[PDB]
Amino acid sequence: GLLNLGVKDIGEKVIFDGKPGYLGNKLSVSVEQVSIAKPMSND
Amino acid sequence: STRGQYPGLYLFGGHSRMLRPVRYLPLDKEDIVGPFEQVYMNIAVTPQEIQNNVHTH
Amino acid sequence: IFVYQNNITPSAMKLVPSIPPATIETFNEAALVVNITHHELVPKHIRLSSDEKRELLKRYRLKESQLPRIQRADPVALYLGLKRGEVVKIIRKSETSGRYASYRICM
């Protein structure tokens, strides 16, 4: 699907620590899969 | 052409195109054409107005 | 009046208002090749006397500053040599009326 190709196109985004050269820890956060469900209610 | 559009052969096969069916005269079948494609070819509106060696569709 | 060829020195344009009450007017020699009052689109301009200025401001009960205005520096006021505050009778041809006298004052 095109949304998974859009998930892949955004890619990974990082942010480092202030805790002690190296910057800290990477946190290479991303999305890798998106899926839409048919509508379900809970009654 | 003299001072016309920039020449070249442009092939398109992607999403979101505009497409209409047209009947192709050698080996009479269906052909699907686009607006960028239609501006240089000679379709006819009825088969009683076909002129020889100029009309493709 | 004073007719010159090409230009006047800007140090010499200070002398044309330098005498009261006698005024000095100034004209090009190339602006006088055609008299503009002979043109078809202009009417017969006639300046009015001090008595005829009173009889116009009395019939219409006008102030001096409520008439239509003519500038002092258009080439018809320069032709007639108008000092400020005097009325010019304008004999105007029209399409359905013909002759009718209009008026302008030069401020």
Partner: protein, 1456 residues
């Protein structure tokens, strides 16, 4: 409004002053101090924005007057701004006086004798002494003793000139402030402020002051003094500054110069003698509005506080932070700097909040709107709630058409008859019918909904039974028990009866006949308005879903104006041209062709049925109380009548007796050849009221001049012609419902011979597209369509836009001459069914509905589908469409469609016809919005100009536009039959009754105006062979000496010279002198009445026909003339009269000597040659052959050498040096003769970097010159340079003239049109051009060289032929006033905000646009206005000074 509640006091004037801080501490109810609007539990907190001292808020009594919500007016409060801040309305003028002033002696930086020169010229302009201010200026490093002697004599001249002019009856001690002294005062203050701002040193004490800087608003900076000229401030023995210090400077500057600034800030003499202060420009106190005017909006629970409470809270939030920043300074570097750097930031934020409260566009931080932006545009306050308002007592509904209504009535529904109501006070003559109305109740027409008691009380009848309601019917006419209300009586708000008046209205109200006053007639059934068909063309109203307004007037002053003045029967003729707008339209015109035919014969039962079906004596249409008939046309075998004889006795019953019948000889739209051979049915003939010949048509009844309804309007009156349109509207409706009228498929067929004529002409169109293509391509003839040279140049035509225009205009010229051959042949001669039976032709020829081009496209062929000038557009490939091959020369392939709407158009013909149909639907959209703002700019200037009782039209403030309306003061709606002398002679005894000459002698002077009209007629026949400059006239016309509304025989000179030209020729018991005595009475009654809103009429007569719409043309031309008054005209021209001596060969070799010749126009090609490694260039410019350009441009070989020598290279040397500056970031020998080696040596000497030069001296074909550069420079293109220089170099040019064309002689005279304006240079050509006949197009250039009255004559003709191109007739009385209003100051002023600044009415300028720019200029001038303009008497609620309110009414009471 209640007519039983008078008012004795009236507002006379207003004046704009600055509201001082001392007043608004005494004005104030309670100062509000905390930025919390309302606290918990829904109460308003005391001390906040919502407060009970500021007004009653939300079911709670006030704390100032103690009243509730409905009765508290709201009260003024304020806040205390702790620092003086900048008022944004005055900051642009505060920054002028903060600059331009010394900071050391605190004068301005001018010398004190020149500041005094403006102090006493502005004093002379406060009074009416516009001329004495220039004599004052004729009074004349320098010691300061004679300067006091200079200031003395200038001050004594003013005190003598003010004393003389106030003694000699001229100027009041309140001064005189006309419009042209507002010009001389605005010109003098703008000159004074411009000269203040440009001063280096203070000319009183000579040392510098630091210049101030304003980047944007909210802040002021001063800059540090330079490092050089600090020496001047040592021989006299950046920084943000505070608004208290800016005020501290200008509290000293305005005191040291009090004697001057009193006249800058006053248009009129200051009789209060108040000081002008710097506190005017600052505001130390904000005024909060009353809390009534800032109540919050509410949508269920969604309640939001008002935008002003959001803006006044942020000022109060900053006004407490700035006091809490003063806590540490009250206790007292690091403890001092952080508390001061945060205090200075509070100074800027309290300024940015006092700006954003007043002006939202002066804010920063989608923004919250301020108090300026509640006033400015459409959706403002002047334009949304003052000039236009929502009204009570008014309905709107869809209209449906209706016969059987008497052409001045409207048909109202029952449910509009119930709701709309009228206050009738009970009297002795009402309690018969107004007691019956109050018994009927709110829901029984005719009834009543309320009774208003004497006390002002009001009793509703809605929730009441009939037993309770009959008791109130016996309460109406009772004597009042209150002495204080003893002269008042009860008002019963009855329903709308059949005798009331109604003002109908359809948008857009493009002219005044789109808002008329109709009578009423209620109708029983449905919920829609009912409009008669004679009104459908005045409102431009069709019946495909139109809805239109219905305003019900509420007093007797308004009922007497929409029955007598704004009446629909008074609006027969429109004042645009004098042509009728009212008449029968579609079925009635198709029925009078059948009724007035020769075939129509009626028996005795039929003939008398059609008369009573239209006359009906009991409703009051007859004038005899018995229907008279005629003897029949035929007596044997049985009696038959004729449809001529129908309308003879229809007109015999609606006419007044003892007044002879109508006499008319007119024609109609149907020719004689449609009725056969020997027919006379084209001319109509009325003789003593009897139709004797001719069909009746659109030209007779219908909106058309000089028909029978237009002639019944003149001889008998407007009440007769409005009654004839009713009776004929019922005579033809009753004729149609017994003898009908259809168009079918039968009506559209040609014959088998006519279809053969059609196809044989269209076979000649198969070669038309090729002959037109072969002509434009400059092949000769008979070349085939597949010729490769034909296809090559057609591809060259397509790539250019102008070459494709002369191909689309030659083919369209040829194929429209094939269209004109089928319409000439196949209709009517080839049609199967013919006239009168051919109903498609019968209603196109009669003007009922349709055209001859409409039946062409139906029955013959549809034609060339023309786009915006051109033919159908072509693709990039040379194909017009995918069906057609590229570049084929077929007429069908380019938009000429041969198929007709009867038999169909082909799919490629269908697609071309859809391109032209979409073109019409966009021009119907985009070109009805451009003429809407033409009329708004026109009506705002011309709202107040009107006929005075001097018959001398003038503006509302008193300034005079013209001395007589049109030069003759006759009304356009009364001058139609004024020069129709053959009509008025045939109807002499019937026109003598309506003017009644014997009863109208006592109030006249018949004797005196006739004598002076013979002294001038004899003088002008004797003189006036000479031209106009020789005529010392010695005698004015009788209009300029005698009042034409009182003196009989005081007529215009065209009326006298056309009556004495008519009555001389033909000699026809009326003699010669009784006809000239009745036309002069017809002239005098056809004078224009004083009070006519002429400039509205003159601006509606231009804006409404503008919706009907090689030089600029149309509504873009009217914007250039009227709206912008552009001196930068788009395409100026100049018409040059060729003499009779010079022939056509001496005139077109003459226009080759004026039209410019570029150097680009003579060059074939330019071949540069660059060899580098000193950068060299070989500029070789190749020309055409000398026999080719010396014939085409009359350029000699030697003159082309001088352009390269003295003009081309001096522009080329500049362009090379300009680019090197901006980048720092076969032929002959060389030993030719001694002169060419020195011709070369002079080119090298006087130029910068030339090393060689040679022109083709023996043939004039080439010019080669070497052009070296330095080796340091990088690469220049040197062809794009040369081409741009070759297009700017001129071989020969008369300045400001680029082309001179010799067109075909239009209308006899020989014409030579140029494409640019230079009058000085065309005066040298006396031998070719009549210099005393040079007219033009540039209205601003004829004003500069020929004067004011010549530009006034130029502007009339240019606004004439923009309407004469579309065959639109708008009369020269509306064009005269727009001319004399635009040149009223001796200049060429526009109808915009830049041309209306010289005007006395402040609310007129504020209502138009830029409201708070004219607002500041009024309050700075302290401008009092007399409330004269119509835009200024609606803001304050006065009766107008135009028309009905142009006088007062006084009541003669018998006892002293």
């Amino acid at each position: 409004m209640d007519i039983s509640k008078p008012v004795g006091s009236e507002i006379t004037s207003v004046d704009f002053g600055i509201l001082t801080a001392k007043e608004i501490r005494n004005l104030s109810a309670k100062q509000i101090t905390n930025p919390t609007v309302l606290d918990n539990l829904g109460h308003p907190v005391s001390g906040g924005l919502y407060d009970l001292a500021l007004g009653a808020f939300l079911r709670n009594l006030c704390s100032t007057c103690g009243l509730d919500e409905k009765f508290c007016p709201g009260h003024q409060g304020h806040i205390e701004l702790p620092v003086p801040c900048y008022n944004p309305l005055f900051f642009n003028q505060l920054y002028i006086y903060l600059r331009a002033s010394c900071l050391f002696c605190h004068h301005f930086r001018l010398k004190s004798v020149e500041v005094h020169r403006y102090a006493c010229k502005l004093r002379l302009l406060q009074y009416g002494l516009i001329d004495e201010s220039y004599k004052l200026d004729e009074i004349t490093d320098i010691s300061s003793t004679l300067l006091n002697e200079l200031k003395s004599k200038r001050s004594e001249y003013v005190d003598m000139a003010i004393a003389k002019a106030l003694s000699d009856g001229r100027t009041t001690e309140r001064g005189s402030f006309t419009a042209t002294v507002n010009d001389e005062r605005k010109k003098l203050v703008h000159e004074f402020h411009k000269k203040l701002l440009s001063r280096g040193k203070c000319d009183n004490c000579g040392m510098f002051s630091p210049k101030f800087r304003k980047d944007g608003f909210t802040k002021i900076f001063e800059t540090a003094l330079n490092e050089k000229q600090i020496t001047n401030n040592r021989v006299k023995g950046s920084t943000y500054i505070l608004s208290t210090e800016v005020k501290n400077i200008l509290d000293t500057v305005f005191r040291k110069e009090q004697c001057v600034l009193q006249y800058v800030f006053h248009s009129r003499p200051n009789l209060s003698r108040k000081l002008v202060k710097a506190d005017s420009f600052f505001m130390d106190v904000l005024v909060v509005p009353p809390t009534r005017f800032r109540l919050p909006s509410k949508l269920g629970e969604e309640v939001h506080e008002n935008s002003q409470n959001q803006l006044l809270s942020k000022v109060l939030t900053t006004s407490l932070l700035i006091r809490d920043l003063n806590d540490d300074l009250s206790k007292l570097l690091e403890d001092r700097r952080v508390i001061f750097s945060r205090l200075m930031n509070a100074f800027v934020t309290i300024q940015n909040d006092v700006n954003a409260f007043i002006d939202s566009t002066k804010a920063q931080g989608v923004p919250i709107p301020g108090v300026k932006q509640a006033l400015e545009k459409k959706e403002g306050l002047f334009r949304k709630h003052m000039m236009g308002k929502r009204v009570n007592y008014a309905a709107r509904s869809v209209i449906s058409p209706d016969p059987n209504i008497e052409t001045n009535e409207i048909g109202v529904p029952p449910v509009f008859a119930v709701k709309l109501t009228y206050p009738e006070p009970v009297t002795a003559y009402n309690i018969a019918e107004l007691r019956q109305a109050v018994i009927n109740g709110p829901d029984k027409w005719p009834g009543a909904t309320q009774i208003q008691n004497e006390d002002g009380s009001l009793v509703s009848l809605i929730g009441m039974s009939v037993e309770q309601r009959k008791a109130l019917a016996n309460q109406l006419l009772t004597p009042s028990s209150n002495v204080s209300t003893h002269t008042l009586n009860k008002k019963v708000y009855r329903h709308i009866k059949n005798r009331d008046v109604v003002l109908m209205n359809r948008q857009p109200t493009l002219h005044k006949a789109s808002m008329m006053g109709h009578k009423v007639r209620v109708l029983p059934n449905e919920k829609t308005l009912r409009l008669h068909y004679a009104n459908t063309g005045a409102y431009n109203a069709d019946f495909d879903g139109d809805e239109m307004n219905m305003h019900f007037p509420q007093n007797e002053n308004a009922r007497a104006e929409a029955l007598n003045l704004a009446n629909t029967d008074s609006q027969y003729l429109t004042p645009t041209s004098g042509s009728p707008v009212r008449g029968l339209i579609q079925d009635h015109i198709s029925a009078g062709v059948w009724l007035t035919s020769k075939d129509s014969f009626f028996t005795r039962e039929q003939y008398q049925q059609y008369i009573y079906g239209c006359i009906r004596p009991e409703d009051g249409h007859t004038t005899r109380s018995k229907i008279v008939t005629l003897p029949p046309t035929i007596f044997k075998p049985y009696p038959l009548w004729t449809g001529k004889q129908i309308i003879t006795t229809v007109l015999l019953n609606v006419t007044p007796p003892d007044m002879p019948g109508i006499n008319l000889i007119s024609k109609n739209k149907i020719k004689n050849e449609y009725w056969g051979k020997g027919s006379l049915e084209n001319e109509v003939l009325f003789k003593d009221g009897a139709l004797l010949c001719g069909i009746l048509d659109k030209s007779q009844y219908g909106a058309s001049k000089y028909g029978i309804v237009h002639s019944l309007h003149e001889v008998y009156g407007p009440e007769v012609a409005a009654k004839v349109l009713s009776v004929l509207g019922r005579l033809f409706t009753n004729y149609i419902t017994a003898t009908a009228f259809t168009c079918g498929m039968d009506d559209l067929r040609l014959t088998a011979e006519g279809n053969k004529w059609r196809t044989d002409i269209l076979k000649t169109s198969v070669d038309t597209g090729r002959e037109a293509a072969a002509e434009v391509t400059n092949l000769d003839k008979d070349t085939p369509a597949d010729d490769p040279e034909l296809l090559k140049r057609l591809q060259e035509i397509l790539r250019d836009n102008n070459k494709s225009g002369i191909l689309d205009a030659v083919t369209s010229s040829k194929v429209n001459a094939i269209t004109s051959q089928v319409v000439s042949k196949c209709v009517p001669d080839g049609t199967m069914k013919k006239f009168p039976c051919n109903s498609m032709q019968a209603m196109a020829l009669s003007g009922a509905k349709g055209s001859n081009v409409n039946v062409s496209q139906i029955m013959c062929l549809l034609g060339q589908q023309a786009l915006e000038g051109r033919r159908v557009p072509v693709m990039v490939s040379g194909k017009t469409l995918p069906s057609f091959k590229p570049y084929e020369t077929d007429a069908m392939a380019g938009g000429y469609v041969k198929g007709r709407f009867y038999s169909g158009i082909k799919p490629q013909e269908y697609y071309f016809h859809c391109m032209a149909g979409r073109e019409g639907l966009i021009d119907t959209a985009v070109k009805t919005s451009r003429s809407g703002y033409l009329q708004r700019c026109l009506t705002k200037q011309l709202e107040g100009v009107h006929v005075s009782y001097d018959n001398s039209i003038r503006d509302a403030d008193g300034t005079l536009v013209q001395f007589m309306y049109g030069g003759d003061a006759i009304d356009i709606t009364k001058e139609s039959h004024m020069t129709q002398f053959e009509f008025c002679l045939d109807n002499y005894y019937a026109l003598l009754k309506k003017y009644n000459p014997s009863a109208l002698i006592e109030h006249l002077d018949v004797e005196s105006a006739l004598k002076y009209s013979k002294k001038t007629l004899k003088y002008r026949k004797k003189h006036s062979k000479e031209p106009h400059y020789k005529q010392s006239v010695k005698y004015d016309p009788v209009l300029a000496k005698y009042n034409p509304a009182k003196y009989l025989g005081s007529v215009s000179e065209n009326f006298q010279d056309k009556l004495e030209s008519f009555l001389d020729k033909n000699s026809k018991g009326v003699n010669e002198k009784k006809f000239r005595a009745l036309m002069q009475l017809k002239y005098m009654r056809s004078l224009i009445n004083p009070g006519e809103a002429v400039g509205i009429i003159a601006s509606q007569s231009v804006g409404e026909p503008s919706t009907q719409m090689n030089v600029t043309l149309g509504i873009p031309r009217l914007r250039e003339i009227v709206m912008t008054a552009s001196a930068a005209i788009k395409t100026p021209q100049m018409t040059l009269p060729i003499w009779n001596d010079v022939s056509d060969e001496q005139a077109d070799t003459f226009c080759k000597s004026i039209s410019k010749v570029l150097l680009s126009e003579v060059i074939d090609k330019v071949i540069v040659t660059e060899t580098t490694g000193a950068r060299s260039y070989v500029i070789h410019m190749r020309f055409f052959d000398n026999n080719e350009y010396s014939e085409e441009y009359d350029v000699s070989k030697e003159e082309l050498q001088n352009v390269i020598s003295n003009q081309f290279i001096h522009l080329l040397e500049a362009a090379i040096v300009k680019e090197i500056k901006k980048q720092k970031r076969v032929e002959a020998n060389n030993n030719m003769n001694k002169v060419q080696r020195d011709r070369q040596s002079a080119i090298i000497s006087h130029h910068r970097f030339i090393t060689k030069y040679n022109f083709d001296d023996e043939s004039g074909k080439w010019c080669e010159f070497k052009l070296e550069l330095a080796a340091d420079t990088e690469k220049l293109l040197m062809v794009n340079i040369v081409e741009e220089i070759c297009r700017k170099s001129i071989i020969r040019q008369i300045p400001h003239i680029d082309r001179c064309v010799h067109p075909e002689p239009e209308n006899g005279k020989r014409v030579l049109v140029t494409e640019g304006v230079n009058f000085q240079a065309m005066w040298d050509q006396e031998a070719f051009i009549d210099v005393d006949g040079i007219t033009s197009n540039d209205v601003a250039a004829v004003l500069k060289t020929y004067g004011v009255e010549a530009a006034r004559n130029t502007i009339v003709n240019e606004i004439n032929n923009v309407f004469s191109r579309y065959a639109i007739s708008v009369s020269f009385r509306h064009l005269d006033l727009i001319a004399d209003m635009m040149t009223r100051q001796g200049t060429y002023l526009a109808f915009n905000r830049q041309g209306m600044e010289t005007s006395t009415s402040s609310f007129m300028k504020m209502s138009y646009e830029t409201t708070c720019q004219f607002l500041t200029k009024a309050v700075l001038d302290n401008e009092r206005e007399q409330l004269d303009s119509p835009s200024a008497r609606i803001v304050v609620g006065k009766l107008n000074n135009v028309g009905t309110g142009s006088f007062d009414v006084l009541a003669k009471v018998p006892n002293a």
